[PDB]
Amino acid sequence: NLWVTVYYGVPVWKDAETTLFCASDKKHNVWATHCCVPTDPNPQEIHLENVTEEFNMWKNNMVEQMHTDIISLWDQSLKPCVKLTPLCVTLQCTNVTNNITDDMRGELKNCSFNMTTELRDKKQKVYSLFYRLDVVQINNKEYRLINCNTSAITQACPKVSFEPIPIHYCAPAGFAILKCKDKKFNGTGPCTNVSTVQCTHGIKPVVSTQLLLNGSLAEEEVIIRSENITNNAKNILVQLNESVQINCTRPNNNTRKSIRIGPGQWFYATGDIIGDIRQAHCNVSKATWNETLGKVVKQLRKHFGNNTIIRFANSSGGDLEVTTHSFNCGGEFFYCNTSGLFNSTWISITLPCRIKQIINMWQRIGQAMYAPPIQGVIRCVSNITGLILTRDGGSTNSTTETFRPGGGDMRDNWRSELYKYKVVKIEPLGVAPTRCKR
Amino acid sequence: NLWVTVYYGVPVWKDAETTLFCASDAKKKHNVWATHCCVPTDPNPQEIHLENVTEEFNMWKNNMVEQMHTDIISLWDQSLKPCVKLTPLCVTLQCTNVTNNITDDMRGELKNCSFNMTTELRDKKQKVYSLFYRLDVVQINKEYRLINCNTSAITQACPKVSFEPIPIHYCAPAGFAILKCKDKKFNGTGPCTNVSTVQCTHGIKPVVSTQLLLNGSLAEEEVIIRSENITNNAKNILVQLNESVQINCTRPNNNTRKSIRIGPGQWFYATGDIIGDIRQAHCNVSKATWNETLGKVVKQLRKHFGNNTIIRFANSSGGDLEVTTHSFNCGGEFFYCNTSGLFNSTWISITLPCRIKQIINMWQRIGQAMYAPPIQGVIRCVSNITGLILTRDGGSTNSTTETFRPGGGDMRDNWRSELYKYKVVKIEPLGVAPTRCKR
Amino acid sequence: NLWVTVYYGVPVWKDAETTLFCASDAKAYETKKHNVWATHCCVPTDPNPQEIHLENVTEEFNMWKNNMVEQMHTDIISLWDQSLKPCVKLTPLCVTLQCTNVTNNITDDMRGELKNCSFNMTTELRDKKQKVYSLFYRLDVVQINKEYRLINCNTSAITQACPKVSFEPIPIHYCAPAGFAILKCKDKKFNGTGPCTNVSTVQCTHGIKPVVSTQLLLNGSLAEEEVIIRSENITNNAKNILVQLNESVQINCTRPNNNTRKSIRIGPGQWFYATGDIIGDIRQAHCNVSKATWNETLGKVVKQLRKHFGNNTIIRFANSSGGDLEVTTHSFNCGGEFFYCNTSGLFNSTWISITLPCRIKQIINMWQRIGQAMYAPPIQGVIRCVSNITGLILTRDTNSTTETFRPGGGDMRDNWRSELYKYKVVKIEPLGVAPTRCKR
Amino acid sequence: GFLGAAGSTMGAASMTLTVQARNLLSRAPECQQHLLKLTVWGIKQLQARVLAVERYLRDQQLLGIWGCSGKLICCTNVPWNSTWSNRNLSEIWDNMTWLQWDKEISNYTQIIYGLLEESQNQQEKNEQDLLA
Amino acid sequence: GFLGAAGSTMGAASMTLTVQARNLLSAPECQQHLLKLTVWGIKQLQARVLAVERYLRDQQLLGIWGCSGKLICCTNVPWNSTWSNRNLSEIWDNMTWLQWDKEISNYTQIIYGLLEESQNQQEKNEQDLLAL
Amino acid sequence: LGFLGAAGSTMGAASMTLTVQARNLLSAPECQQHLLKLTVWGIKQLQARVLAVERYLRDQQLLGIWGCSGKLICCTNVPWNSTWSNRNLSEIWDNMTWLQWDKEISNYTQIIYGLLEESQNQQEKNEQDLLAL
Ligand SMILES: *[C@@H]1O[C@H](CO)[C@@H](O[C@@H]2O[C@H](CO)[C@@H](O[C@@H]3O[C@H](CO[C@H]4O[C@H](CO[C@H]5O[C@H](CO)[C@@H](O)[C@H](O)[C@@H]5O)[C@@H](O)[C@H](O[C@H]5O[C@H](CO)[C@@H](O)[C@H](O)[C@@H]5O)[C@@H]4O)[C@@H](O)[C@H](O[C@H]4O[C@H](CO)[C@@H](O)[C@H](O)[C@@H]4O[C@H]4O[C@H](CO)[C@@H](O)[C@H](O)[C@@H]4O[C@H]4O[C@H](CO)[C@@H](O)[C@H](O)[C@@H]4O)[C@@H]3O)[C@H](O)[C@H]2NC(C)=O)[C@H](O)[C@H]1NC(C)=O
Ligand SMILES: *[C@@H]1O[C@H](CO)[C@@H](O[C@@H]2O[C@H](CO)[C@@H](O[C@@H]3O[C@H](CO[C@H]4O[C@H](CO)[C@@H](O)[C@H](O)[C@@H]4O)[C@@H](O)[C@H](O[C@H]4O[C@H](CO)[C@@H](O)[C@H](O)[C@@H]4O)[C@@H]3O)[C@H](O)[C@H]2NC(C)=O)[C@H](O)[C@H]1NC(C)=O
Ligand SMILES: *[C@@H]1O[C@H](CO)[C@@H](O[C@@H]2O[C@H](CO)[C@@H](O[C@@H]3O[C@H](CO[C@H]4O[C@H](CO)[C@@H](O)[C@H](O)[C@@H]4O)[C@@H](O)[C@H](O[C@H]4O[C@H](CO)[C@@H](O)[C@H](O)[C@@H]4O)[C@@H]3O)[C@H](O)[C@H]2NC(C)=O)[C@H](O)[C@H]1NC(C)=O
Ligand SMILES: *[C@@H]1O[C@H](CO)[C@@H](O)[C@H](O)[C@H]1NC(C)=O
Ligand SMILES: *[C@@H]1O[C@H](CO)[C@@H](O)[C@H](O)[C@H]1NC(C)=O
Ligand SMILES: *[C@@H]1O[C@H](CO)[C@@H](O)[C@H](O)[C@H]1NC(C)=O
Ligand SMILES: *[C@@H]1O[C@H](CO)[C@@H](O)[C@H](O)[C@H]1NC(C)=O
Ligand SMILES: *[C@@H]1O[C@H](CO)[C@@H](O)[C@H](O)[C@H]1NC(C)=O
Ligand SMILES: *[C@@H]1O[C@H](CO)[C@@H](O)[C@H](O)[C@H]1NC(C)=O
Ligand SMILES: *[C@@H]1O[C@H](CO)[C@@H](O)[C@H](O)[C@H]1NC(C)=O
């Protein structure tokens, strides 16, 4: 004598892929401008008593959206800015040997060129400094900007800030964000401690490679996460439970020149350096780094065997963007040599850095950005919160296993902070039998 | 012994800010406003008198004003967006004076320039000759350049596009209503007794002007002074008049236009030679009408300042041409008229010389300048002065005399003149009240 | 005492205009990515649509005023322009050309129809210049006074179409939004405007290929097995006549010259695709129509045509009236290139293997607009194309005994009117009332 | 069978009215990518979807006002007029195509709608007054 | 007149609930220019979407409270003298609905919470009674 | 308790929380202006909002089709089939959550819905004929 009854408002959800709308708590900050919707002053996390749920960070749709949207914002930021097409001319360059430390001779060049002025008929002589990474030789003194043979270069508007600011992703009505609270969750499988939130915590959109900067720490113990721990074709994301402080700088005291590239437009040129020329570099505490690696190794031993002979080595060859550590400090673009961090086998550190002004903001090509010069001296301090590593393939049963740092899609940085979140949709109609009939 | 009862459709509302629809009379073409403010208004306004309803209006905080400001600028830009750029013309000019049929007033005002510019083919160059007004051209180092070369880009308005103001009606979306204050002699803020509800506002012509307000309402029965704060000398005063003052504005010179091919499919429209004698543009104001009108304003000012206070007017103030003179868009060309002859009196026909400029930063923002194509023939406009924008030059220990100046550099305050009587509210249909029933 | 009864749903409708949406089926990946009609009719079709046989329903289908046609037209214009947005401009090529004749291994029929031009053009850098060489068809080059310029330079800027983009008709289906339905007239001999009894309802139309042509309609329907003549008003000489045939006539078009392409850098991310140099002998483009088939087909049209004229009057056909190239010749777009074929050989008889010479043009004004211009990249190799002639656009214009018909062009709307002559769009209006035996 | 058969008996239509009601209401990421770039097509499609929703709701609101919501067929208290139609059930119910007859009543439709709203207005007051 | 009842007393205003309810949910050349002006297209479209959402929120509440289908419903929640200490004649003593609403103001949220809980408890009780 | 606080609760107890989910499903001008200018983003949000309305209305129409609109709890004239579930009534209303129940009988969702539609049409026709007299 049971009859079908229908209940509307049943607390049941199914996995879903929907658009998230972005919110957050300067005025020229691109992220702050876009995610301008204010957040909940006091978000309410609701613990779900006796709910078990499965999470999979490697297929997390939230990561894919963060990737798509951040790329779009960079394009929107540059969309209204001045093009540098008029500067793609033959350059007449000299060596710049005045007050240069011997170890960096050749990094800077001093080039002159014929630029148009605001009136179309008149021309002007312009002098500007460049890095050797941006300027390429034609066929002794004649050079061109590297992208003259591939793409238009758009300079960034000098007022725009690209400083990472925490961003919170919120569910649209009908959806909810579930999160794991379990410690030591390795990314693929059920978690027992599950809460529901309206928005994620604030995630800073930090763009970097090899070493993840300014993220969260792994509670009380190092967590090694990978899609497949025995597949050398997959990347390993290592989250540290301690931060490592790194001090980076560009010591040269710079000046900015601004010239009349065209009506209503200005081009930003690097002017004479006020003082001596020295290399950009980063400081890593030596003892701290040695302890950090030992901790990572302990966790690798658990996955690969207690024989624990493990070797670290430098990055593979390839393009500058993948082989060196990359970051944006003070608005400047740095590429740093990390071989000094991966020189031990288990059983202060100064990293030299180079500066580049013409930037491919993402792995795609055909568009490029010009980074205007920043005056003064740039120095910043940041936290290393995790690493991206690849286990080398090769002969099996090696007594010594090998790991090397490396890059990959930007998606992988975002997978770290978002590893604990999932989006589901609420489906309110439930049907069950009972004793009630009309 | 009453119980809760819920009623849906109760006549209750709260103040709100929403988007209004732009509607116009359902009847010319190629007019920016008429083309884009496309929703027709054929029904007569459904004005519903509200018996025994008191409501508070505040013109100074009215968001209908802000919304028109934003939409007008936005529409302006969309109109100009697809038109030919004149950036190819920012070249060194070779200029001499026009000495042909020159009187004393226009001597040095009109200048004859020639220059090297492009042709349909990218290999060729041509020499062309055009006239400019002095206000648009700056001397460098006979060598001149257009003034809008170092700070902005210049675009040309499309010759087929008219910017003549036509009536605009703002209409509420469903769920909203517009409350209209019909009290006569109503001051800028406070409660209204004669309140009615309409679906759309009275048509408003988006006339752009400085110092004097034109072709608006007439303040019913008397001169009315409205201000945010009369005491505070940092505020502007909007004064509406109950008599129209006729003003005739003329640009007597007979122009011709030259069509020049700047590039493939592109045209530049240049001012050609003047046919006939050269004379200064000017506007006529009746002497007695102005004198009596101003005296009426003065009486109303004493109403707030005292019967032993002398009221004097001063001739404008220092500053940019756009705010020191009275700007028209007469015939589609831009006049900058001298008002010193209107505001030189002390209380205890008139001809205004005008200058013409073609490169206009119509909005106060900098970076986009529009070039007005010349209009051939002779231009005559006849219009109604319906109000004044006055500044009280206060802030001093001189109770004996107050000084007023014409002024105001912000079009935002022009729309406040017509929208002061309207308010937008949101309808809230659910109400709860007790009565003698229960389930 | 039968009172008002309110019915929520009622099987009724009224004629209505509404925006329709497009669906199509790409059968292959390249089509999905680069075919203009495939990328912008993303929505897949219904794997199994149904037709509902309404019975004892008689309805009017006015094709001349059909909004459905109007939407197809405006939609194709917009789509065409959209496909050209992310493409290289050829503004830098609007320069003086130095041109001579191509005299090497050329038949006299082509003499003067092809020129060898050179010019100074930009390079990757703003300062440096290069001299280049290319060939042009006579139609696109105008002498200025051996100095020439491209014909578009005094009217509009020209954009080169993107080299891998394909503009090739695939079946297109129009589908109704919910609340709307598409009615069809299945009457075998249904004449363009007026009621019919064979009415059915569908969710989507059958596929229509958006084939663009100007005189002869290609790759359409075959008139429900009878030759059918449709027009808005037979009497009015200002109206066009759409004639559908009950069998197809094949037309074999070839562009025999073996072309090559030259890729020229004109800026940092900009390439121009030039016409190259012809390999082998130079011959005239042409189309072949079976003579016997064409004769017989035309005779059938005449027999039906006379139905609305005197039984023994003379039907005279003649070639095109004066007009522009796009009007007087048969514009045939195939293999990626635009042919303008001379059809006078098809309309030179009086009633009571035909070789048509063709011209090639690269600068195109697809929709008869002159505010733009397009440049067609050259196609390498040799083009051979066989099409099905399915119908004609004809113009009739006190000669009690003799009347004259000429082929001619018109608005592209006419091509679509022909294919969509049988469809109508209606709006469903569920509410209604009746007097019945009940009270509250 | 979306339209059923217009030519069927008016009462026969009852069998497909559920179907007609359900058919009033309506995954390739790629269509989404194209529409977002194709701004004008994006707007036209949203407007079409919004219209469908508004039309649906207007009809439901109207049934609500008339006191005919929650059912496919509503008996009301409005007298039938001979000026609208003067035929018995054999002639006007069992022997009619819905479409031809729908057209004739259209003249008088707005009259009927106003009458339906008033009848319900009176009924609601009466029920509130009875429930002392 | 849509707000014609604005000056009416609460009692008198009960006869115009229908006109307001209808108003709440109320050229090719215009369509072409509005679509081109992408921003005006979006602003107007957003307004239409919001109007629908607001309409639905009110209807859902009447559903939740057990008042759907009617413009006027009696409930099973007693009136609290705290919300208003006026008697019936005073409540309807020539007070404009709007004035009265201003007096209740903040008590609205409390009332809704009470109505929602009451209806849910009622449905459980009815489910059990039907089963018996 | 919270919005999905009953998610891990026994099915019976959780029924008294239905009001909150039912309502939640239908729940800074400087920011608005920026995002309005950003056309693509604005379109994505409109699509999201329109769909949310569409889903809501779909569910309401369906309760209408089944004839129990306005209620959170619907009783029927359609019997439960042992084919759909052969579980104990004790198990169904206790010692299980709604999440578990939903996946266990997800295979029959469409069957039940079709049966409910037929039941309602039969009931209305009978009521139409009973009132007629
Ligand atoms: C109305 O509807 C009709 C359909 O009913 C539409 O007609 C169709 O239209 C399409 C589109 O134009 C055509 O598709 C292309 O066809 C070509 C050629 O194939 C046809 O012609 C062959 C002729 O060769 C034989 O006869 C000649 C006589 O003069 C003789 O000289 C020669 O030696 C030889 O004997 C036929 O053989 C061929 O098969 C036919 O015959 C069969 C007989 O038994 C019969 O059974 C078949 O049914 C058929 O009739 C056919 O008729 C194809 O080459 C072309 O394919 C492209 O893509 C493929 C895929 O990758 C590629 O492999 C090809 O090489 C080619 O791509 C290259 O060439 C393109 C230019 O055509 C160029 O743009 C590409 O970039 C690419 O170039 C690159 O590769 C080359 C390689 O050599 C390299 O060197 C370059 O540097 C570069 O890297 C298409 O399939 C249909 O054929 C046509 N149908 C008919 C019956 O004609 C009609 O369009 C509609 N009407 C309108 C107005 O729209
Ligand atoms: C990990 O997290 C750290 C900590 O937030 C980030 O490092 C910070 O980065 C910001 C942005 O570059 C730094 O802020 C800048 O400081 C400059 C120096 O200011 C000194 O002098 C002023 C005097 O008034 C003091 O108030 C101030 O405290 C300092 O002592 C300023 O000159 C900068 O302002 C100028 O540039 C900005 C550009 O956006 C313009 O908007 C301004 O108008 C102005 O022209 C700016 O305030 C901050 O100092 C850094 N802190 C540390 C510890 O490094 C890391 O970058 C982040 N990691 C990664 C990878 O991003
Ligand atoms: C306050 O309000 C007044 C009244 O509306 C405004 O003054 C009017 O302004 C309009 C616009 O400039 C004037 O209309 C123009 O009249 C010109 C003269 O027409 C002659 O030829 C016609 C026959 O064709 C005769 O009937 C007529 O008597 C004249 O002999 C026309 O040439 C103008 O049209 C030209 O420009 C338009 C674009 O706008 C093109 O489309 C046309 O093809 C053509 O090239 C135009 O019709 C009107 O006459 C003025 N009225 C008065 C009394 O002077 C004020 O400007 C307004 N004040 C403010 C501050 O805005
Ligand atoms: C100096 O010029 C030579 C080429 O003549 C080059 O090889 C060398 O690297 C240059 N030195 C510097 C500091 O640029
Ligand atoms: C953690 O890793 C183990 C293998 O050592 C695997 O079986 C388990 O499912 C993983 N759990 C998570 C949450 O990733
Ligand atoms: C309101 O209008 C009436 C009639 O127009 C007028 O007499 C009265 O003075 C106005 N002012 C009031 C009553 O608020
Ligand atoms: C009148 O306007 C003045 C503006 O200074 C304002 O201070 C005053 O309160 C207004 N009075 C009313 C309520 O009309
Ligand atoms: C048949 O076609 C002719 C052509 O104009 C048209 O005038 C006539 O009305 C059509 N007849 C019908 C009803 O199909
Ligand atoms: C068709 O055109 C003729 C003139 O050629 C005209 O007399 C006749 O009335 C027209 N018929 C229609 C369809 O209106
Ligand atoms: C072809 O058509 C002509 C009429 O133009 C006719 O005289 C001739 O007999 C026809 N030939 C055939 C194929 O019978």
Answer positive or negative: Cα dihedral of C56, C61, C66, C72.
positive
Q: How far is CA B15 from CA A246, B10, B186, in A?
A: 55, 16, 20
Alpha helices in chain F (DSSP H): 11-14, 18-24, 29-37, 39-65, 89-93, 98-104, 109-132
In DSSP notation, E53-97 reads HHHHHHHHHHHHTT-TT-SEEEEEEEPPTTT----HHHHTSS-BH
Coil/strand/helix, residue A428: coil
Under a CB-based contact definition with an 8 Å cutoff, are residues C83 and C159 in contact? no
Secondary structure element (H or E) that encloses residue B337, with its range: strand B333-337
Supply the DSSP symbol for E52: H
Nearest-atom number in ligand 7 for the CA of B304 is: 5
Farthest CA pair distance, chain B = 97
Distance CA F57, CA F60 (A): 5
Q: Which residues of D touch F61 (CB under 8 A)?
A: 21-22, 25
Kindly identify which residue of chain F lies nearest to residue A52, measuring between CA atoms: F8
**Pocket lining: C351 vs ligand 10, CB cutoff 6 Å:** yes
Show residues of chain D in contact with F44, CB under 8 Å.
36
Chain F partners of A438 at a C-beta cutoff of 8 Å?
75-77
Residues 6+ apart with CB under 8 A from C23: C41, C43, C44, C45, C46, C172, C173, C174, C175, C204
Half-sphere exposure in the Cβ direction for E107 (13 Å, CA): 16
Q: How far is CA F7 from CA A44, A195, B154, F3, in A?
A: 16, 11, 63, 9
Q: Alpha-carbon dihedral of residues A15, A17, A23, A29, nearest 10 degrees?
A: 140
Check if the beta carbon of residue B281 is closer than 8 Å to that of residue B356.
Answer: yes
Token readout for C247 is: 């069998």
Q: Is B176 exposed, middle or buried (0-12, 13-18, 19+ CB in 10 A)?
A: buried
Stated as kind and residue range, the H or E segment containing C435 is strand C432-436
**Which of C167, F36, B129, D56 lies closest to E39 in space, CA to CA?**
F36
CB spacing of D124 vs E71 below 8 angstroms: yes
Instruction: Name residues whose C-beta falls within 8 Å of residue B330's C-beta, 6 or more positions apart in sequence.
Output: B249, B251, B379, B381
Q: Are strands B401-406 and B310-313 parallel, antiparallel or unpaired?
A: parallel
Residue holding tokens 């004669």? B194
Residue D105 to residue D111: CA distance in whole angstroms = 10
Q: What single-letter amino acid sits at A177?
A: I
C154 to B124: CB separation less than 8 angstroms, yes or no: no
| Torsion, Cα of C436, C437, D1, D7 (10° steps) | -50
- CA diameter of chain A: 98
Can you read off the two tokens belonging to residue E64? 């939740």
Q: Which residue of A has its CA nearest to B115?
A: A121
Count Cα atoms within 13 angstroms, Cβ side, for A64: 11
CA nearest to E122 within chain B: B439
Tell whether E128 is within 8 A of chain A (Cβ): yes
Q: Round to whole Å and give the CA distance between E50 and E54.
A: 6
Residue D85 alpha carbon to ligand 2 centre in Å:
83
CB atoms within 10 A of CB F80: 20
Q: Among residues C31, A75, C39, C22, which one has the least CA distance to residue D30?
A: C39
Residue A227's Cβ-side half-sphere holds a number of Cα atoms within 13 Å equal to 11
Half-sphere exposure in the Cβ direction for C217 (13 Å, CA): 29
Name the helix (H) or strand (E) containing A297.
Answer: helix A286-304
User: How far apart, in whole angstroms, are the C-alpha atoms of residue C409 and residue C321?
Assistant: 10
Contact (CB, 8 A) for A112 and A129: no
Q: Which chain A residues are within 8 Å of C126, Cβ to Cβ?
A: 85-86, 88-89
Q: Are B418 and B204 in contact (CB under 8 A)?
A: yes
Which residues does chain A break after (C to N > 2.5 Å)? 25, 139, 347
3-state secondary structure of F92: helix
Integer Cα distance of C392 and A125 in angstroms: 66
The range of the structural domain enclosing residue D116 comes to: 12-26+28-130
Question: In whole angstroms, how large is the CA radius of gyration of chain F?
Answer: 20
Query: What residue spans of chain D are helical by DSSP H?
Result: 17-22, 29-37, 39-66, 89-92, 98-130
Nearest CA to ligand 4 atom 13: A106
Residue of B nearest to E30 (CA): B38
Interface of B with A in 135-174 (CB under 8 A): 145, 148-153
Q: What 3-state class would DSSP assign to B376?
A: coil
Pairwise CA distance, residues D54 & E27, whole Å = 19
Q: Is B121 helix (H, G, I), strand (E, B) or coil?
A: coil
Contact C96, B119 (CB under 8 A): no
CB contact at 8 A, E71 and E17: yes
Domain count, chain F: 1
* DSSP code string of C49-90: --EEE--S--EE--STT-HHHHHHHHHHHHHHHHHTTTS-B-
Which residue from C173, C206, C207 is spatially nearest to C42, judged by alpha carbons?
C173
* Contact call for C125 and A152, based on CB within 8 A: no
Q: What is the DSSP string of C196-261?
A: ES-EEEESBPPPB----BSSEEES---GGGS-EEEES-TT-TTS-EEEEEEEEEEEEEEEEEEE--
CB contact under 8 A, C126 and A366: no
Q: Nearest by CB to F50, from D25, D49, D70: name it.
A: D49
User: In angstroms, rounded to a whole number, what is the distance separating the alpha carbons of residues C174 and C75?
Assistant: 11
The answer to whether the Cβ–Cβ distance between C178 and D23 falls below 8 Å is: yes
Residue bearing tokens 């107890």: F13
Which ligand has the shortest distance to the CA of A247?
2
Cα–Cα distance for residue pair A124/A115, rounded to 1 Å: 6
Task: Point out the ligand 1 atom lying closest to the alpha carbon of residue C387.
Answer: 1
Residues in chain F: 133
| Closest ligand by atom to C293 CA | 10
The burial class, CB within 10 Å (0-12 / 13-18 / 19+), for C136 is buried
Residue bearing tokens 């003194």: A141
Q: In Å, how far is F83's CA from the nearest CA of chain E?
A: 23
Atom of ligand 3 nearest to the CA of B332: 12
Q: In 3D, which of B20, B163, B153 has the Cα closest to residue B88? A: B153
CA–CA distance, B362 with B369 (Å, rounded to integer): 8
